[PDB]
Amino acid sequence: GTRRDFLYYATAGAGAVATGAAVWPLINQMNPSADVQALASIFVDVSSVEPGVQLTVKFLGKPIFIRRRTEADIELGRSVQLGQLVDTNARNANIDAGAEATDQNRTLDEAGEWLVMWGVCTHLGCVPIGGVSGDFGGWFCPCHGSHYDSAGRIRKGPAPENLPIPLAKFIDETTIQLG
Amino acid sequence: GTRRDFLYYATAGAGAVATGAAVWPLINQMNPSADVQALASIFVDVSSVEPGVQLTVKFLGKPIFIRRRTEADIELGRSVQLGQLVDTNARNANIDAGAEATDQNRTLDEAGEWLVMWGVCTHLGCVPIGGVSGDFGGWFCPCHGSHYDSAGRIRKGPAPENLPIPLAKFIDETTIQLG
Amino acid sequence: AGGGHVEDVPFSFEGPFGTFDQHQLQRGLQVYTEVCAACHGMKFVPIRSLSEPGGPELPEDQVRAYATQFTVTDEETGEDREGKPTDHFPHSALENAPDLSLMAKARAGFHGPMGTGISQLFNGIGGPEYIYSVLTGFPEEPPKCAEGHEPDGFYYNRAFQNGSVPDTCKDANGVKTTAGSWIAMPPPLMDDLVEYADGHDASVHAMAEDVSAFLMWAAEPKLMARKQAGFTAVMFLTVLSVLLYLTNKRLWAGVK
Amino acid sequence: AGGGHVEDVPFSFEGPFGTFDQHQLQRGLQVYTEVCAACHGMKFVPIRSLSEPGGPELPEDQVRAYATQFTVTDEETGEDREGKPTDHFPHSALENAPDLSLMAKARAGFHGPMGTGISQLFNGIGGPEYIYSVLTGFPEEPPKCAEGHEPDGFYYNRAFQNGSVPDTCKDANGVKTTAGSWIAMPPPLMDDLVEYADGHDASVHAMAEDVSAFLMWAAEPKLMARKQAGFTAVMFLTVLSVLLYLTNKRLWAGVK
Amino acid sequence: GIPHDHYEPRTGIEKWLHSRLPIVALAYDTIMIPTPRNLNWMWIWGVVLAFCLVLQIVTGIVLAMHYTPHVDLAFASVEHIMRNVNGGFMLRYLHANGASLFFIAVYLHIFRGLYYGSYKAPREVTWIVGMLIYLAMMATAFMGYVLPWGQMSFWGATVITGLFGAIPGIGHSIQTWLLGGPAVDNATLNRFFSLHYLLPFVIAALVAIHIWAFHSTGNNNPTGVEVRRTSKAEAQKDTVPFWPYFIIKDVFALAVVLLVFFAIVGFMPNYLGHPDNYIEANPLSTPAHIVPEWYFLPFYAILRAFTADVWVVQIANFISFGIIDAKFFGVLAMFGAILVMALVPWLDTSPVRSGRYRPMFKIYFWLLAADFVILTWVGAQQTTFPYDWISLIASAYWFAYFLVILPILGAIEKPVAPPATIEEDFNA
Amino acid sequence: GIPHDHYEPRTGIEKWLHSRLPIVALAYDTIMIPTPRNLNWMWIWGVVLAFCLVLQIVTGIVLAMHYTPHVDLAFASVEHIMRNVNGGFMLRYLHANGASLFFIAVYLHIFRGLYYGSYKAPREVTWIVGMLIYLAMMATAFMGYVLPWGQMSFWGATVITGLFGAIPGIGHSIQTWLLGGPAVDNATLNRFFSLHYLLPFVIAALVAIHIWAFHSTGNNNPTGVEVRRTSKAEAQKDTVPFWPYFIIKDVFALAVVLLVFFAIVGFMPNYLGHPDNYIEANPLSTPAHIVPEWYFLPFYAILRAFTADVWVVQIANFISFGIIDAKFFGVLAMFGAILVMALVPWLDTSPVRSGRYRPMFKIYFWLLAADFVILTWVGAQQTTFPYDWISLIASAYWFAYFLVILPILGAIEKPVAPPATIEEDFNA
Ligand code: HEC
Ligand code: HEM
Ligand code: HEM
Ligand code: HEM
Ligand code: HEM
Ligand SMILES: C/C=C(C)/C=C/C=C/[C@H](OC)[C@@H](C)[C@@H](OC)[C@@H](C)CCc1oc2c(O)c(OC)cc(OC)c2c(=O)c1C
Ligand SMILES: C/C=C(C)/C=C/C=C/[C@H](OC)[C@@H](C)[C@@H](OC)[C@@H](C)CCc1oc2c(O)c(OC)cc(OC)c2c(=O)c1C
Ligand code: FES
Ligand code: FES
Ligand SMILES: [Sr+2]
Ligand SMILES: [Sr+2]
Ligand SMILES: [Sr+2]
């Protein structure tokens, strides 16, 4: 009848719920525990950095590059036209999401001297090698051969995007606040 | 024949050796590694010990008891006859192995004031509770109910032996060297 | 040593539907910081957990301000700095003062009868009740049996059972006569030693009950989450058991 | 960066029957202590292993005396004390000086040909050969392509391949022309910088070869035990393979 | 070897797979085995044990993803689980209380077998595999309890490693080998972790053999009368297929067990625990109120009952020239109590399988059940009078049951006639 | 399902045991299966894999007794093994080099199957179970290499969890779930330790089905002609019993493999390793000469071959509206390379099983074997010209072989007649 079949549905429906209630916590325990910080904030002293020096700093378990760019680095970055870039988005947390990847939109200052970005290859997360490496006067990722230029923009290789720029701002003349 | 069975012997004999050579290191890796100290040497300051106080010190991962015995403790220890003891051996590394468990042979000094011994129950290794505990004015082991007297000798329970006394001697007026 | 009698306090968190009083935990937190923290640490409690739901639930800015007072040795730097919410409470400043992170669970106040465990089954383990009794059990005069035989540096406490006792306080069989024994903790509380912000009375009774609730939360911060899950599982399985009972019956019907 | 040429030293420990030279390892230890230790640590080497068989095998009293020179922070006390044999060698004093515990295994001196690994198959990985080349590969004059373009605080080394190189030392594709590159380590050695007790010569050649052998031991202290086991296992299995071959043959005879 | 119908592929996918890998045929023949119709509620504890093994394994693997086997970090990593891992507090209490449920089930499972003669021929192999599982369970649960590195963890490890030190001659070598040093330390914690992970997989392998064992012979039932095998016609009057009839019955009973179990975990998760294991391991101080895990108490009570004063110990020590002192005697007594229970198929000389039809046997069995509860209770009391006597008398009866009563009973008892068939019992 | 004789208990213990648990009967029917007489030396790699699984497990449990899954202690604890644990250095080199031996054997094992058509009907299940095993091996070996927490450990873990970030939409969630945070840290190491322990037991369970699978169908042989099953007379002309004939051959072959294997471990244990994993993990610096484990190189070469400049990639990006960029394309190419090999029973449309009698097939097969070696070699080179093209040409041929050549060959090729029976080939 109609009252007979209702038991076999209600029982099976309850059984289905019980499996789901047990499986979700077995998955969610692998999600970040309460001791894990998603975002944080720190301050970096930069007065000792001459042009041509890259400072590498740990932030959320990953490297952040703070390079005081030379004259050559700045000139090369500005000479690249937007249409010659793999990724034309600035990837800059400090400005609008739709901003273009011009060298001006890749630095913290108007002079374009301070390049602050995640030293995390956008391919699969290795640390690109700086010191003017690669074929575009920037960084070379030794893991699968991505080349970034002097503004940290991806130019060659498997990596899909420019190295991201975190929230970063000078709190005073000589100190950058990340986050 | 004679050589036909010999091949089957050399093969079976080799297999036995091969198993033995493989099984022994799987057992021996569990024996103490090189970072483990078997015996070591240390010094204990005792000037702060009043009569009736037990000092408990860590040595080779186990507790060592240093009790400055009171008048009552010493008299009780000397009043016990050998035939009333479960274990009549002194268990004292500092004197002959066959020495008897008289109260004199259980202390470092002739006056019998300084009782130094391993605070390791001779039953199954728990730490007996001191402060004149148990039924014999000494120590009580809460793990299976062993009672030790004022000289640390086993009197009642499953424990087979008196608490062992390590190599111990006064290096000067106020310092005991264990080991 | 042994077990003893504890005062049966009615804490809000007791019973299957029991829950923490948020303001009480904050008062208890104030007591810990102003009194207990001088000697006792909570090395397993992250300071940030004061914000988590089901506890004191302080705004994250207050917790950030609270963490500053602690001097933490930074792991990477190795140099000292102000505390953050991500730091744990410090270790015990006093070497023989036990850590209080898990005290409310590492002590049982209810035992027996005749070692059948029935007492704990109905009254709970009784850890926060025990803490309350120790904070309450400091009398101004010691028991008459030790009039002038107190060990120096120790104090008689009614509820403490693991302490030493003078020879004059034992019977002919060596068992102690006193309800409690001598503890190395001097009486930490005293009327209005703490000035509660909400004007809650700060008698030894209130502070002892308040800090016991805080110490219950520090030991079992997920208590409320644990019970919600219990209710859900029991209601699920009650329904499921009924459905499975009728199902089992209607199946075996075609046999008997 | 890339791989490069290393000087093929004939170390005693190479080959299946190769073994450490006891006197050489001791000389290398003196070089490490008197020269390298100023900057480099060996944080994974227990000092007591200087007594263990298969190494320098110094008497345990000498090692005990040797350990005193180090100032170690005791784990429980937290205060400084003299070193014991049970302590490890200190960490690198100079922050950018790599730890040398495993250097002789963390560097390969032989590469190729054309990335086929055939070079390593016959000459070994070549770590101590690499170390020897770095200690040796400091020329008094730099290469002509960088006469006055040297980075400040760096030094040209023939064998170091992971260093930076001036722009005037790169070809049209930016690949470096020089055999080596610029290393942050100043030349640590110099003729008779160390006074060996037995009067052994202490030229840069001798110290570089002696300390490379010591650093090979620090990385693979159980090298000799491993080969004995290799020899033994091979001799067992040689006999066993022959016997199993004959067994397999006489069995399948009754089929074909 | 009971007559039954076999699997037959119907869908095209089934015909395809069955001619390559008969895995469906194996699952079908397993889940449709004709099982005696008259099984009562004491036959459910096998599934409860089955659930427990999976619960412990799945929560265990998960817990090991957040736990650190190092003495400096072990205790802290469990508090990290309790406080920080999502649902970590619940997974731990499930794993810990899951061990108690695991042990409640074997004791009911075991005593079921002792009453209904499920160990008697042809089921000796089923019984012995069970005994091997039981030893593995104890070793696994012991080592798990060590991992938090609390006070009970550390001193339980000290004591239990000390058991092996009581063996004459070789005792200290085994003890040093188990410890990896002069004392319980990191080497001990590190190796106990590896073995705590391994053994549950051995148990799983043993359970597979266990199931294979009682599938070959067929399940026992309350009457002890075997299913008729002369034809398929009369096997069905004694049986119903395992699926659906007993699957649904198992799932129902399981839902009720979990109702109680989840109420415990949700509302009183620490009742069956020792508060002192929330205190960090202290190698210089043993807690005064140290007590074993409740499921170990009966064997603990037996061991410590044999003190120096006990006269059979004094005879043993004298006759053995001192080799068997109270210490070693107590160890022999404890493992011997488990061994005589393993030997009950060869000690029970009665040809009547089910104890339901053995009037004298019922008396001595229920005394044994009471004795097991008594032994559990005295384990938690002091060793003073009268508990010292209660534990000696209780130990004596345990050995008397297996070594004296059961052999004697099989040559004296006058049993009642069981039913002719299972069908007769079911209709009644 | 070949005709053969069955077990019969002889000893009283066997008659006793067989009527309760036919476990000896199960061992008999397994070890006495009639196996084709004409198996060559390419049929040994199953036992080598079997030995490896036991070796890794026995050395693994032992290593887990001394290893600490904590970022601050992991690397040091492995050096503790090398320097302090009795025989620890040898146990470490055996576990590490044993993984290489494990992978040498599968690749030889796999290509054996690809040549002789051991994947074709009725052996699809054996092949698919094999493919599941192969994935489990890779996941196990990956997580094991992370445990020492060297430079290769840390950055390999960063990259391989990064593979999962390439899935559109859900990629970032999966990566965080695998990592347990924003980056490779302690939570990641800790869970990899638990899973590195678990999966070898899952492989063992899969191997059990694997053995059951080819026991149900019977072993393939070099001729591809199945054993005659019409009578026991003609089944015996095609076969010999597995024991003793192939046991001794396996033990013999195994001893020769171990002779070489122990020479590597004894005299060049680091040849197959990367020196950079003797450097502590540095989350701020990736080595310039970072290279995967050799047994991962072919699949690594395929992934990085697909850059933004690749023509087929630019079409994919355009047609897919940007979803499939070079990053995700390379991941699809890498897992796709394994999948098309899993699908080879349904892509090889030829009815001739063994490639020995397929003239055109032999050419493209040996190109695949050569191609697989090329991919391994190019994996270790730089990404500059010409290696960038070599990896593109090699990747292209890998997919062309399975997706184009094999389907086309089965409808064009003129195969040679195989022997009438297995007996004919053996006698020749
Ligand atoms: C400070 C004055 C040093 C002394 C004395 C020694 N070393 Fe050193 N070393 C030092 C630094 C700062 C570095 C880093 C090099 C860099 O460019 O970053 C090194 C490096 C090494 C290496 C590693 C080479 C490499 O491939 O990275 C080796 C093998 C090495 N040094 C060897 C070595 C030895 C044997 C020394 C004693 C004879 C020694 N160095 C002394 C700083 C200093
Ligand atoms: C038959 C199976 C098992 C039994 C009987 C068992 C038993 C136990 C017990 C009693 C504890 C102590 C819990 C406590 O007091 O907090 C424990 C702890 C632990 N077990 Fe198990 N366990 C089993 C399976 C497993 C498996 C398979 C694993 C890991 C893969 C595991 C991992 C752990 C861990 C990590 C701990 C310490 C963390 C904790 O205390 O919760 N367990 N186990
Ligand atoms: C993890 C542990 C165990 C599991 C999963 C398990 C599982 C089972 C199951 C499912 C059954 C059938 C259902 C039932 O009879 O309740 C069974 C029966 C049985 N088990 Fe166990 N068991 C375990 C431990 C043991 C132990 C420790 C013993 C004995 C010391 C034992 C002895 C028996 C016996 C005698 C039977 C009766 C089977 C028959 O009647 O033929 N088992 N077991
Ligand atoms: C630890 C992993 C493995 C073990 C222990 C194992 C074991 C075996 C054994 C003993 C055989 C019998 C023939 C021989 O020895 O050559 C066999 C055959 C086979 N294996 Fe594996 N194998 C493993 C992995 C794999 C993998 C990864 C694949 C495929 C991707 C695979 C596919 C096959 C096939 C197709 C056969 C032929 C079966 C037949 O002769 O009918 N195996 N395996
Ligand atoms: C059965 C297949 C297995 C494979 C293919 C495998 C593979 C590996 C590999 C390649 C490593 C890296 C070795 C190194 O470079 O240091 C490793 C590490 C390790 N594995 Fe396994 N493993 C297996 C089984 C196991 C099991 C079952 C366990 C533990 C019970 C285990 C425990 C370890 C440990 C402790 C390490 C780190 C220490 C070391 O090996 O150097 N392995 N594994
Ligand atoms: C590498 C692994 C090893 C060495 C495993 C060995 C396993 C041996 C046995 O299992 C088969 C063993 C667990 C089992 O003996 C039959 C138990 C019933 C032993 C019962 C037992 O427990 C105690 C315990 O838990 C404690 O906790 C705080 C403290 C204890 O003293 C006060 C004990 C104790 O005095 C006894 C007798
Ligand atoms: C909890 C468990 C998890 C997350 C399991 C995930 C398993 C994923 C896959 O297994 C099925 C994976 C192992 C397998 O992909 C088919 C390999 C062939 C991937 C090969 C691989 O290796 C690398 C490697 O080893 C490195 O070492 C230092 C470094 C690497 O960058 C430079 C790589 C790398 O770029 C690739 C593509
Ligand atoms: S990780 Fe940077 S290129 Fe692949
Ligand atoms: S350990 Fe002290 S009596 Fe059992
Ligand atoms: Sr109450
Ligand atoms: Sr050489
Ligand atoms: Sr182009």
CSV table of C-alpha atoms in Angstrom, one decimal, chain C residues 72-185:
chain,number,residue,atom,x,y,z
C,72,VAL,CA,57.0,35.8,24.3
C,73,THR,CA,60.3,34.7,22.7
C,74,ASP,CA,59.6,34.8,19.0
C,75,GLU,CA,60.5,31.5,17.3
C,76,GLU,CA,62.2,32.8,14.2
C,77,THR,CA,63.7,35.9,15.8
C,78,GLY,CA,64.6,34.4,19.1
C,79,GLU,CA,64.3,37.9,20.6
C,80,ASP,CA,61.6,38.9,23.0
C,81,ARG,CA,58.4,40.7,21.8
C,82,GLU,CA,54.9,41.5,23.0
C,83,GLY,CA,52.4,38.7,22.9
C,84,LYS,CA,49.9,38.0,20.1
C,85,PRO,CA,46.6,36.2,20.2
C,86,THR,CA,48.3,33.3,18.3
C,87,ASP,CA,50.6,32.8,21.3
C,88,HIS,CA,49.7,30.4,24.2
C,89,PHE,CA,49.5,31.6,27.8
C,90,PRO,CA,52.9,31.4,29.5
C,91,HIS,CA,54.3,28.5,31.4
C,92,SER,CA,53.9,28.5,35.2
C,93,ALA,CA,56.1,31.2,36.6
C,94,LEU,CA,56.4,29.1,39.8
C,95,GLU,CA,58.1,25.8,39.2
C,96,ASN,CA,55.9,23.7,41.5
C,97,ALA,CA,52.6,25.5,40.6
C,98,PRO,CA,50.9,23.0,38.3
C,99,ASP,CA,49.7,24.0,34.9
C,100,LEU,CA,46.0,24.9,34.9
C,101,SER,CA,45.1,24.2,31.2
C,102,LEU,CA,43.5,20.8,32.0
C,103,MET,CA,43.1,21.0,35.8
C,104,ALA,CA,39.3,21.0,35.6
C,105,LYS,CA,39.5,17.6,33.9
C,106,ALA,CA,42.6,16.2,35.6
C,107,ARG,CA,40.9,16.1,39.0
C,108,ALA,CA,37.9,14.1,40.2
C,109,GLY,CA,35.8,15.4,43.1
C,110,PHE,CA,33.3,12.5,43.2
C,111,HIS,CA,34.3,8.9,43.9
C,112,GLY,CA,32.7,5.6,45.0
C,113,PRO,CA,30.5,4.2,46.4
C,114,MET,CA,32.7,1.3,47.4
C,115,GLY,CA,34.6,1.9,44.1
C,116,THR,CA,31.6,1.2,41.9
C,117,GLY,CA,31.8,4.5,40.0
C,118,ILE,CA,28.1,5.2,40.4
C,119,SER,CA,28.9,8.6,42.0
C,120,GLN,CA,30.6,9.9,38.9
C,121,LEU,CA,27.8,8.5,36.7
C,122,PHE,CA,25.2,10.8,38.3
C,123,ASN,CA,27.2,13.8,39.6
C,124,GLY,CA,29.9,14.1,36.9
C,125,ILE,CA,33.6,13.8,37.5
C,126,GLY,CA,33.6,17.0,39.6
C,127,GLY,CA,36.7,18.8,38.6
C,128,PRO,CA,35.4,22.3,38.7
C,129,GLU,CA,33.7,21.4,42.0
C,130,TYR,CA,37.0,20.3,43.3
C,131,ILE,CA,38.8,23.5,42.3
C,132,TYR,CA,36.0,25.4,44.1
C,133,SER,CA,36.5,23.4,47.2
C,134,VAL,CA,40.3,24.0,47.3
C,135,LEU,CA,39.8,27.8,46.8
C,136,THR,CA,37.1,27.7,49.5
C,137,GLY,CA,38.8,25.3,51.9
C,138,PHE,CA,41.5,27.5,53.6
C,139,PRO,CA,40.5,28.0,57.3
C,140,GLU,CA,41.9,30.9,59.3
C,141,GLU,CA,42.8,28.6,62.2
C,142,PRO,CA,44.3,25.1,61.6
C,143,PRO,CA,42.8,22.0,63.1
C,144,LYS,CA,43.5,21.6,66.8
C,145,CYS,CA,45.6,18.4,66.3
C,146,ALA,CA,48.5,20.5,64.8
C,147,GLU,CA,48.4,23.5,67.0
C,148,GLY,CA,52.1,24.5,66.5
C,149,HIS,CA,53.2,21.7,64.2
C,150,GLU,CA,52.6,23.2,60.8
C,151,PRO,CA,55.4,22.6,58.2
C,152,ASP,CA,56.9,25.8,57.2
C,153,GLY,CA,55.9,26.9,53.7
C,154,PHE,CA,52.7,24.8,53.7
C,155,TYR,CA,49.1,25.6,54.5
C,156,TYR,CA,46.1,23.5,55.7
C,157,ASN,CA,43.3,23.1,53.1
C,158,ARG,CA,40.0,21.3,53.7
C,159,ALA,CA,39.7,19.7,50.3
C,160,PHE,CA,43.3,18.9,49.4
C,161,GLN,CA,43.9,15.2,50.0
C,162,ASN,CA,47.4,14.5,48.6
C,163,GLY,CA,49.4,16.7,51.1
C,164,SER,CA,51.5,15.8,54.1
C,165,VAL,CA,50.0,15.8,57.6
C,166,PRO,CA,51.7,16.1,61.0
C,167,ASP,CA,52.2,13.0,63.1
C,168,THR,CA,49.7,14.4,65.7
C,169,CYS,CA,46.9,14.3,63.1
C,170,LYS,CA,47.0,10.5,62.4
C,171,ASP,CA,45.1,7.8,64.2
C,172,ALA,CA,46.6,4.6,65.7
C,173,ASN,CA,46.7,3.1,62.2
C,174,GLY,CA,48.4,6.1,60.7
C,175,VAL,CA,45.4,7.5,58.7
C,176,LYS,CA,44.9,11.2,58.9
C,177,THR,CA,42.2,12.6,61.1
C,178,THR,CA,41.7,15.9,59.3
C,179,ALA,CA,39.2,16.3,56.4
C,180,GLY,CA,42.1,17.6,54.2
C,181,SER,CA,45.9,18.1,54.3
C,182,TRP,CA,48.7,20.6,53.9
C,183,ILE,CA,49.2,22.3,50.5
C,184,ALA,CA,52.1,24.3,49.2
C,185,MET,CA,49.7,26.9,47.8
